[PDB]
Design a protein around this nucleic acid. Structure first.
Ligand SMILES: CO[C@@H]1[C@H](O)[C@H](n2cnc3c(=O)nc(N)[nH]c32)O[C@H]1COP(=O)(O)OP(=O)(O)OP(=O)(O)O
Ligand SMILES: [Mg+2]
Ligand SMILES: [Zn+2]
Ligand SMILES: [Zn+2]
Ligand SMILES: [Zn+2]
Lengths: 44, 257, 67, 82, 49, 8, 428, 49, 115, 528
RNA sequence: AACUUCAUCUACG
């Protein structure tokens, strides 16, 4: 999938079985990024 | 054996408030008119939210809650609009709902206050009572809120977002003459605004034959419906509930026969 | 965290009044006089502005996850 | 024991009533023939209560005396506590 | 090198020490956080007197 | 909290 | 006056507490020295010449209220409550929901509760300023009537206004974080994050694995109902074993954040946070700042709640029977002072030993704003509209939502899982 | 906590101003777990030389 | 998780009758009307209007349980009168009162404005 | 070791055999429900859907059970399992199983728990047998168990976060046994003290005291509304007590319709003058005290905890001993319903005005405190001058302490009596104390007049510091303020030293409770 | 068609 970087906030695409290191910053904390499917919220 | 003939005198009428007096009416009828003010007057409010992108600090359902609480002008088309359950079409359509859109991004350095003004309606009659503005969220630079909402007809019994009124002030017997409230020390108690007593007399003399009449109302609008039309719609809705009850009662009596 | 839309007790819209309240406090107005100028009459509505703690400004200091 | 020399109480105890009613209820729920004419009662426990009131439960309680002996008291013979 | 000593947060040897609230926010640390705890295996532990 | 004969 | 004036200009005057200590104005005294020191609680009342109790005072307390700790310092008018009630309030204030920290978004902590709309108390102690209670408050000011309305506030329960609850009153967010680490123990046996396959992986469950993304981790923003698969982890079997994590039963949340990192070992480590927005129900527990708590007995809408002449309906109705045996008069004084503060626009001062704030002064202040001296109000019955004969005590009191909620405690068992050793039903 | 003696748990007079009288856990630890008062400070230690 | 949906308060589920009439055997000429999905709003109005009638010996309403949504109205009338007729007449009287109120409120509105 | 496996609590013998974890049990928080009957309990839908009762398929219930099976586990009034004759458990949750939906006689449908099911309800600790009682299920929305408030006292339960366990019998035999041996109406009277375990409590008690005063007069509409909530009503409106000028019933006249059958009882109200019985107006009782119920009609009197409470000879106890347990259940429920609706009319509250007393009352309290402090000073001077002589069996220290304690306690009692004299009829502290619903005269006195002496270990506040109580007091001060006497009331507010001493007293009480639990538990286990 | 234990601590009535 595409993981946003923790520090430099640049999306990087990491394949499975690949070390979690952002290109150009090296931070080891990535975030999965919001889903394409949309969820309905009742305003209640 | 028949209903009394009530009389109305309107003391104050402002875009936000209606102060009126209903005389020669029962306490039950007056209280239930107040109750219908609060809970059974139809209004338009957001009840469907789909957030495409929410990078604000507030989570998605927080934003949805705040959007629902935002009042929307419902003066005329709320009577025309149908309930979603009644509408034949699946989900929502122009007859059963109104669509709103929000696409705000804080490109500038300064904090962007997303307001109700940023909500854009597909139909001009329903606008978020913008004509300050209700603040939905504050966006830091690089934060974006995108969402689509659908507003539907409903009344406050479902949810407080559909309350058309802010505060319904209801008072009867301004000077305690029916002794419905028994003061332990009458002098300590402040006089009502509608009180006709002299300053020396704390309470009016006990009226043994009296009955609660001459009810005083102050209905404050939330801005969605005009304060006059809140009262008119409440009276009409209570009448419609009674007529539906009578129709079902007649049907069941015929069935029993 | 952010000023609630509608007073809990009655439902009068108090969400549009927080920025004006802060501005009137900056002017010179006492809290009570600013609350009166904004139109808040019942102590229920005055509690909404008077007791509000605006944490959204502190949360906006942190950098966004996606820029 | 015999009909003579019955020393236990004639009244049915609360525990005997509970166990007899439960046992008769379970039997009725297990398609056992019902002695009383149920008046549209479809609950086995209610039917058992109805039989108990009419003294038609076909059970005899064997009460064990502390010396080891036993006395057989019919449910009809016992006086209903309630 | 003989070992590693866990550092109490916001103590003199913590990296957060001597940082203004803006700098603390840049590091995603609360200005109001008191400190006085250790992060061991990712969990905050407080020594009880 | 009351007295010696009462409660603490 | 020189010292106090310099401290008043503290910033840009480079005068601090350490300068006060260096001057010899203040001194640190421990218990052994407290045994040999004559103290005055207050300078004016005690040091000044009167009928001479002691004429050899060696020290003076800076302020008596400092004898309390952090949790007891939030209690307003603590000298007007029974002593066990202040202990109860300390314990319950450790359990109130609020914004625990401002960086709560960054942190992935299991079991985090954060309140939507925290408010600072209308009646506040001065020492609260040094506890940062204004900065990160926990609880909301609420119009509270002390009345017996429909019997659903009896014992210690509390009736609540459903309209207020619908407008955001005491709404909270519960974040649960789940951690999973893929690891290799055997040389041929490894754990991999992946979407489990019905045929490829021997172990499976009815639970939907579709929500899992390609990496085996649910993306943020996906609704996850109880027993759905948050993380998909499969172990090679020397075909595969399913060690995928599932939601705690009845969690029913929405994924907030999914972080993927490498732990110290170098193995992949995943943390997933789930949001569940909890609205107040009729089992949830709310407590005042005075040591008397209660579950929500029932929720009535604004049409049903009793209303005053002005149209105000109490957010919370508490039974009067709580007050007498517990003797938490600080609660009543706080309601009166909160009414005065909300009408005046100031913030009430409830420091423990003020001696300048009597109840009579608060009553006289409330009289000026058009209310009854003692805070009673003529309430109209919501159902029938008739005036309630007994005038009812109404005022703004600060209430806290305790972390104990009924949804977390409801449980039922029917032929479920069974232990291996005892072959008896399991625990928990 | 197991000990039922009501001597070590009671609020001593010397706790005045240094341990909160109100704030104590309730249960097996009544009066055994305490909390500092607001102005209380604990000596860090010094050389007696 | 066990929270009832909001629409349960006023929406009849399929197969639910708005009104069910059961006579009361304890007393002659008495009836018990069970209205479903209704609250004090209608119950108090109807009880008051029934009380105004001279041939109604008894009129009362109750909500059997606050969490559930139902209204029970007991009406006992004199001989030569039917409780069902009393209920119908009460409803018609309330409707007429409310329509008169609407007309007079509209007139009051038009007079407060425009002068 | 093997011994450790079998030895103690959590061992096999005690932790696994004498007691064990069981199926078909549900725990959740409890909230009040005045509308439910005594035996009824309120069960959330989810708890009722998880728990099941196996019902044997018979020819007379085959249709209903087949409908339940068709609904399945998803629709709530459904069945979770179908147990065949062979013992094979067809599962209705997993997949339709259309061939296996068929039911024949002998099959067991595990239907969901429904309204009317008998369930044991329990609160820990089960100190007496009334702590486990059989309740009839009623399914209500939301997630808490809901129980009548008269049933709170046997369970020792208050709705402040308490939880209750629920055990569902799984057989008709054990269901009947529970229903007869343990049903709540059958548990009304305890064998421990031959008194009713349950009585009118909390709001209902205060509202009953107010309702049964002579002053209460109810108009026609209020009478009809209250009669609406009376289940045992005969449908006949009693002729009003006052026919003219306007028809007005009385609270006693309506409560007379609650009292079942023909019950005869004579009690006395808490505020009964001892002089009235000896002197004239024995049967007139100017204060409307006394309580006379003849032929099930309340002729005269005001009801309180002495008449409607848990005590021997109460109206509740006589109803149980005379009319039976079912009729007594109806009696409790009707009292609660109609008196709660009258309370909706009259209302009840507590405020600051209740704590306030007259200015003269405060002045008298202050004068009493001044005189007491002066007398303690005089006693201390006698002791210092060695005039004091030891009381037999006591040291000079002990006799001095006893004299000072006597003076302080007498002053405290006098201030309390003055505060109680100040109380009006409308005072709500007094209303709750008189009804017996909550509070005591000690609490009123402490609220209004004087908190009283703070004593630790049966003595005034000890000399914890060296020969003084606090550093603020001078050494060797035996006066009231130094040793713990609190002259300020809770309303007035404790001074800082009084605050600390009060904290010491409260701490001692809390320690006593916490230590008490374990010793009493061990004793109870040994006895059993 | 379905996920171990110990131990500790912290809370609950
Ligand atoms: C009334 O007695 C109950 C029971 O005895 C049961 N219980 C509670 N804790 C324990 C325990 O540790 N061990 C055992 N065996 N039983 C226990 O709890 C007792 C009271 O405790 P409390 O005094 O705190 O009740 P508030 O007076 O405080 O009630 P508020 O106003 O908060 O609702
Ligand atoms: Mg409790
Ligand atoms: Zn990066
Ligand atoms: Zn449509
Ligand atoms: Zn308001």
């Amino acid at each position: 999938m595409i993981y946003i970087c923790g520090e430099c906030h640049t999306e990087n695409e990491i394949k499975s079985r690949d070390p979690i290191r952002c290109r150009e910053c090296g931070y080891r904390i990535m975030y999965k990024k919001r889903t394409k499917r949309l969820v309905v919220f009742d305003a209640r | 054996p028949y209903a009394n003939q009530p009389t109305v005198r309107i003391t104050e009428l402002t875009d936000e408030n209606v102060k009126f007096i209903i005389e020669n009416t029962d306490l039950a009828v007056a209280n239930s008119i107040r109750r219908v003010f609060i809970a059974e007057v139809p209004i338009i409010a957001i009840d469907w939210v789909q957030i495409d992108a929410n990078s604000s600090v507030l989570h998605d359902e927080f934003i949805a809650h705040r959007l629902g609480l935002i009042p929307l002008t419902s003066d005329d088309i709320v009577d025309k609009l149908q309930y979603s359950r009644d509408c034949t079409c699946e989900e929502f359509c122009p007859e059963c709902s109104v669509e709103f859109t929000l696409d705000v991004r804080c490109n500038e350095d300064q904090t962007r206050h997303v307001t109700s003004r940023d909500l854009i309606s597909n139909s001009p009659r329903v606008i978020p009572v913008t004509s300050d503005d209700i603040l939905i969220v504050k966006l830091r630079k690089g934060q974006e809120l995108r969402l689509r909402a659908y507003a539907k007809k409903g009344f406050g019994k479902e949810h407080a977002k559909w309350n058309p009124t802010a505060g319904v002030a209801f008072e009867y017997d301004p000077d305690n003459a029916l002794r419905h409230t028994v003061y332990p020390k009458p002098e300590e108690w402040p006089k009502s605004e509608y009180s006709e007593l002299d300053e020396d007399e704390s309470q009016a003399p006990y009226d043994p034959n009296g009955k609660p009449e001459r009810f005083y109302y102050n209905v404050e609008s939330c801005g969605s419906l005009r304060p006059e039309t809140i009262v008119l719609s409440a009276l009409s809705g209570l009448k419609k509930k009674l007529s539906d009850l009578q129709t079902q009662l007649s049907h069941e009596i015929q069935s029993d026969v | 965290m952010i000023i609630p839309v509608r007073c809990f007790t009655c439902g009068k819209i108090v969400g549009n009044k927080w920025e004006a309240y802060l501005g009137l406090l900056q002017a010179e107005y006492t809290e009570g006089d600013a609350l009166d100028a904004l139109g808040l009459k019942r102590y229920c509505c005055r509690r909404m502005l008077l007791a509000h703690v605006d944490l959204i400004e502190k949360l906006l200091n942190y950098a966004p996850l996606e820029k | 024991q015999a009909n003579q020399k019955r020393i236990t109480t004639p009244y049915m105890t609360k525990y005997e009533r509970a166990r007899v009613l439960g046992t008769r209820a379970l039997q009725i729920a297990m398609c056992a023939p019902v002695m009383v004419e149920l008046e549209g009662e479809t609950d086995p426990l209610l039917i058992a209560m109805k039989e108990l009131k009419a003294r038609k439960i076909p059970i005899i309680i064997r009460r064990y005396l502390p010396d080891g002996s036993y006395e057989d008291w019919g449910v009809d013979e016992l006086i209903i506590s309630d | 090198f003989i070992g590693k000593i866990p550092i109490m947060l916001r103590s003199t040897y913590c990296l957060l020490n001597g940082l203004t609230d803006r700098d603390l926010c840049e590091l995603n640390e609360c200005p109001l956080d008191p400190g006085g705890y250790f992060i061991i295996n990712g969990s905050e532990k407080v020594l009880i007197a | 909290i009351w007295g010696i004969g009462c409660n603490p | 006056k020189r010292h106090i004036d310099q401290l008043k200009e503290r910033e840009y005057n480079n005068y601090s507490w350490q300068d006060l200590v260096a001057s010899g104005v203040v001194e640190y005294i421990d218990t052994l020295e407290e045994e040999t020191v004559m103290l005055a609680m207050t300078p004016d009342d005690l040091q000044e010449k009167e009928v001479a109790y002691c004429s050899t005072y060696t020290h003076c307390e800076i302020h008596p209220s400092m004898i309390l700790g952090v949790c007891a310092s939030i209690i307003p008018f603590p000298d007007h409550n029974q002593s066990p009630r202040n202990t109860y309030q300390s314990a319950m204030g450790k359990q109130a929901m609020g914004v625990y920290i401002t960086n709560f978004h960054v942190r992935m902590d299991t079991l985090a509760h954060v309140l939507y709309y925290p408010q600072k108390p209308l009646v506040t102690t001065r020492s609260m300023e040094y506890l940062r209670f204004r900065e990160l408050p926990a609880g909301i000011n609420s119009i509270v009537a002390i009345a017996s309305y429909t019997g659903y506030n009896q014992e210690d329960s509390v009736i609540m206004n459903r309209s207020a609850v619908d407008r955001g009153f005491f709404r909270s967010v519960f974040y649960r974080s789940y951690k999973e680490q893929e690891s290799k123990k055997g040389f041929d046996q490894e754990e991999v994050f992946e979407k489990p396959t019905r045929e490829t992986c021997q172990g499976m469950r009815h639970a939907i694995y579709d929500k899992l993304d390609d990496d085996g981790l649910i993306a943020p923003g996906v609704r996850v109902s109880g027993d759905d698969v948050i993380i998909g982890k499969t172990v090679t079997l020397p075909t595969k074993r399913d060690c995928s994590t599932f939601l705690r039963t009845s969690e029913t949340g929405i994924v907030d954040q999914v972080m993927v990192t490498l732990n110290q070992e170098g193995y992949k480590f995943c943390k997933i946070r789930v949001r569940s927005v909890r609205i107040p129900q009729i089992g949830d527990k709310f407590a005042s700042r005075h040591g008397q708590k209660g579950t929500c007995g029932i929720q009535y809408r604004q049409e049903d709640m009793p209303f005053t002449c002005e149209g105000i309906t109490p957010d919370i109705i508490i039974n009067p029977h709580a007050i007498p045996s517990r003797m938490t008069i600080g609660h009543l004084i706080e309601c009166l002072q909160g009414k005065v503060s909300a009408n005046k626009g100031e913030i009430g001062d409830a420091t423990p030993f003020n001696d300048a704030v009597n109840v009579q002064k608060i009553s006289n202040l409330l009289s000026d704003y058009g209310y009854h001296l003692r805070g009673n109000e003529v309430l109209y019955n919501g159902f029938t509209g008739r005036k309630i004969t007994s005038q009812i005590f109404i005022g703004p009191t600060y209430y806290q939502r305790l972390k104990h909620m009924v949804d977390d405690k409801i449980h039922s068992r029917a032929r479920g899982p069974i232990q291996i050793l005892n072959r008896q039903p399991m625990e928990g | 906590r197991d000990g039922k003696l009501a001597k070590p748990r009671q609020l001593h007079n010397t706790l005045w101003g240094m341990v909160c009288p109100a704030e104590t856990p309730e249960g097996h630890a009544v009066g055994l777990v305490k909390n500092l008062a607001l102005m209380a400070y604990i000596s860090v230690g010094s050389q007696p030389s | 998780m066990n929270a009832p949906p909001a629409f349960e308060s006023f929406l009849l589920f399929e197969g639910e009758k708005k009104i069910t009439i059961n006579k009361d055997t304890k007393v002659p000429n008495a009836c018990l009307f069970t209205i479903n999905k209704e609250d004090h709003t209608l119950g108090n109005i109807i009880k008051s209007q029934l009380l105004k009638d001279p041939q109604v010996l008894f009129a009362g309403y109750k909500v059997p349980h606050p969490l559930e949504h139902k209204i029970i109205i007991r009406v006992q009338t004199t001989p030569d009168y039917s409780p069902q007729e009393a209920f119908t007449n009460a409803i018609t009287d309330l409707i007429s009162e409310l329509s008169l109120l609407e007309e007079r409120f509209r007139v009051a509105i038009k007079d407060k404005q425009e002068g | 070791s093997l011994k450790q496996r079998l030895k103690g609590k959590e061992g096999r013998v005690r932790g696994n055999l004498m007691g064990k974890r069981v199926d078909f049990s549900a725990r959740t928080v409890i909230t009040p429900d005045p509308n439910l009957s005594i035996d009824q309990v309120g069960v959330p839908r989810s708890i009722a859907a998880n728990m099941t009762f196996a019902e044997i398929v018979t020819p007379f219930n085959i249709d209903r059970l087949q409908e339940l099976v068709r609904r399945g586990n998803s629709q709530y009034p459904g069945a979770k399992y179908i147990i065949r004759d062979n013992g094979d458990r067809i599962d209705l949750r997993f997949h339709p199983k259309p061939s296996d939906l068929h039911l024949q006689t002998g099959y067991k449908v595990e239907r969901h728990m429904c309204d009317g099911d008998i369930v044991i309800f329990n609160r820990q600790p089960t100190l007496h047998k009334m702590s486990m009682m059989g309740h009839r299920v009623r399914i209500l929305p939301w997630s808490t168990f809901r129980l009548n408030l008269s049933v709170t006292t046997p369970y020792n339960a208050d709705f402040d976060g308490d939880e209750m366990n629920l055990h569902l019998p799984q057989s008709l035999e054990t269901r009947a046994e529970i229903q007869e041996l343990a049903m709540v109406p059958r548990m009304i009277v305890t064998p421990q003290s031959n008194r009713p375990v349950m009585g009118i409590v909390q709001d209902t008690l205060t509202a009953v005291r107010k309702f049964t005063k002579r002053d209460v007069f109810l108009e026609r509409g209020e009478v009809m509304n209250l009669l609406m909530f009376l289940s045992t009503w005969d449908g006949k409106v009693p002729q009003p007590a006052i026919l003219k000028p306007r028809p007005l019933w009385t609270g006693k006249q309506i409560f007379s319709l609650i009292i079942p059958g023909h019950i005869n009882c004579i009690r006395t109200h808490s505020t009964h003058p001892d002089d009235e019985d000896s002197g004239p107006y024995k049967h007139i009782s100017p204060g409307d005290t006394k309580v006379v119920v003849e032929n099930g009609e309340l002729i005269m009197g005001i009801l309180c905890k002495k008449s409607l409470g848990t005590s021997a000879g109460s109206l509740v106890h006589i109803s149980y001993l005379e009319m039976g347990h079912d009729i007594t259940r109806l009696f409790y429920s009707n009292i609660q319903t109609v008196i709660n609706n009258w309370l909706l009319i009259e209302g009840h509250t507590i405020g600051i005005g209740d704590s306030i007393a007259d200015s003269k009352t405060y002045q008298d309290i202050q004068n009493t405190i001044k005189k007491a402090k002066q007398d303690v000073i005089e006693v201390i001077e006698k002791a210092h001058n060695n005039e004091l002589e030891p009381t037999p069996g006591n040291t000079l220290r002990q006799t001095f302490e006893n004299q000072v304690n006597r003076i302080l306690n007498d002053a405290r009692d006098k201030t309390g009596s003055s505060a109680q004299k100040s109380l009006s009829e409308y005072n709500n502290f007094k209303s709750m104390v008189v009804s017996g619903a909550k509070g005591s005269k000690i609490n009123i006195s402490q609220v209004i007049a004087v908190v009283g002496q703070q004593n630790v270990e049966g003595k005034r506040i000890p000399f914890g510091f060296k020969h003084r109580t606090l550093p603020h007091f001078i050494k060797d001060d035996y006066g009231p303020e130094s040793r713990g006497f609190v002259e300020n009331s809770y309303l007035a507010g404790l001074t800082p030293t009084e605050f600390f001493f009060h904290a010491m007293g409260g701490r001692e009480g809390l320690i006593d409770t916490a230590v008490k639990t374990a010793e009493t538990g061990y004793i109870q286990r040994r006895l059993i």
